[PDB]
Symmetry: C6
Subunit: 69 residues, 6 copies
C-alpha cells in the first residue's frame, strides 16, 4: 500500500516526465513539416498528435484514480 502507492506516484511522475518528452518531440516533428509533404503522412502527424492528447487524458485519469483510492 503506502510505499507502492508511493511507487505508483513516482511511476506517475516518471510518466509526466516521459509526456513532456513526447510533447516536445511532436513539436519537433511539426517543425519538420514544411512543404506540406504527403497527405497520408500529414494524417500521420495528426494521428500522433491525437494519441499524445490521449496520453495526456489517461495520465490525468491515472493521477485522479490514484487520488480517488
Amino acid at each position: 500500500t503506502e510505499d507502492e502507492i508511493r511507487k505508483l506516484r513516482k511511476l506517475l511522475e516518471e510518466a509526466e516526465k516521459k509526456l513532456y518528452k513526447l510533447e516536445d518531440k511532436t513539436r519537433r516533428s511539426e517543425e519538420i513539416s514544411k512543404t506540406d509533404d504527403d497527405p497520408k503522412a500529414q494524417s500521420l502527424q495528426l494521428i500522433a498528435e491525437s494519441l499524445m492528447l490521449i496520453a495526456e487524458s489517461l495520465l490525468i485519469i491515472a493521477i485522479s484514480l490514484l487520488l480517488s483510492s
Copy 2:
C-alpha cells in the same frame, strides 16, 4: 486536496484548449482531404478522426472523474 485538484483542472483546461486546437486542424485537413483513388490515405484520415473523437471522450471522462471524486 483542492489545490491539488484544481491544478488537475488546470491541466484539463489546457487539454480542452488543445483538443479544439487539433479538431480544427482535422476539419481543415478533412476538407483538403484529396479524395483520389488510393484508399489507404482515406482510411488514415478516418483513423485519425476516430482517434480525435476517442480523445474527446477520454477528455470528458477525465473531467468527470476528477469532478466526482
Copy 3:
C-alpha cells in the same frame, strides 16, 4: 454546478452525433472502393473500423460516468 453538468452532457451528445457521421463516412468509404486488391489497405480498413468502435464504447462510458456523478 448543474450548469456545467448540463453543458458537459451537451458536449457528450454533440459527440454522439459527430460519431454517427464518422461511421457513416466510413460505411460509404469502405463500401464503395468497389473491388479490393490490397492487403495493407484491407487491414487498415479493419483498423479504422475497430477504432471507431472503441470510439463508440468510450462514448458510452463517457455517458455513464457523467450520470454516475
Copy 4:
C-alpha cells in the same frame, strides 16, 4: 432514468452487434490474407487483432459500468 439506461442499453447492444460483426470480418480477412512478404502488412494484421481485443474489453467495461450504476 428508467428510459435513460434503456437507451444506453440500446447503444450497448447495438455496439455488441457490430463488434461481433467485425470479429467475423477480421477472422476471415485476417487469415484470407497471407501474402507474407513484409512485417509491415503482418504487423497490421496484428494491430487490428489487438484493436479488436480492446474493443471487446471496452465494450465489457461499458456493460459492467452500466451494471454498476
Copy 5:
C-alpha cells in the same frame, strides 16, 4: 447475484484466452524480425506490442470493474 456476473465472467474469460493467443502470435512474429531492414516496420512491430499491452491492461481493468459490481 453470483450467477448474473457468471454469465459476464463467461464472456471475460473467453477474452483472456483469446488475448493469451494473440500474444503468442505476436511474439512469434516479433521473434521473426528477419535481419534489420525497414524502420517503419520496426515501429509497427513496437506499435503492435504496445497495443496488446494496452489490451492486457484493459482486460484486467475489465476484470476488476466486474469485481466491483
Copy 6:
C-alpha cells in the same frame, strides 16, 4: 478474497515487466533509427512512443482499480 487480487496483481506485475521490455526496445530502436528522410517514419516512431505512454497509464489505472476493489 484478497488473495484473488494478489493473483491479479501478479498478472499486472508481468504486465509491468513486459512494459519496461518494450520500453527498453523503443529507446533501443530509436537510437538505431538514425532516420531523417521521411516524416512518415518520424511520426511512426512517435506513434509507438505515444502508445507506450498510454499503456503505461493504463497499467497505473489497473493497479489502482484492483486495489480499490
